[PDB]
Design a protein around this nucleic acid. Structure first.
Length: 88
DNA sequence: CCGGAGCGTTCAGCGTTCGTTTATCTCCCCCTGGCACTGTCATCTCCGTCAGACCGTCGCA
């Protein structure tokens, strides 16, 4: 999606393939997010019962978790949970 | 018998002091961003109203 975001002229079939890869990447974004909904629910129930509703805490942690997945890299050899927990 | 001196009041030269601003320098407040062993489903409600109606709903006929 970064390559197709550029203004350089490429093949239209190549741009279609890049859009397909971008759609697959967005599907991966989703799949990771519904993978980690359970852990953000657990860490939100860790912080409940203090004047703020449970589902509000879950959704705010979900915002923190999409922040986490925006700032996650595979170069460091650690699991997603221990890095996501700080942002949650 | 005016004339001068002393006295009262009122103004133009420059000489200092105020009234009100301005940008720079500390101290504090306030908001966005980082954390990298792993840690991936809570929570107690609700009963000894109550009195009957109004109403839609729903499975049996």
């Amino acid at each position: 999606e970064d390559k197709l975001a550029n203004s350089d002229k490429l093949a239209p079939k190549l741009k279609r393939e890049l859009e397909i890869i971008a759609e697959d990447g967005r599907r991966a974004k989703n799949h990771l997010l519904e993978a980690n909904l359970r852990l953000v629910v657990s860490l939100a129930k860790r912080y409940t019962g203090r004047g703020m509703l449970f589902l509000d805490l879950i959704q705010e942690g979900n915002l923190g978790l999409i922040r986490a997945v925006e700032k996650f890299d595979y170069t460091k050899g650690y699991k997603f949970s221990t890095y996501a927990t700080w942002w949650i």
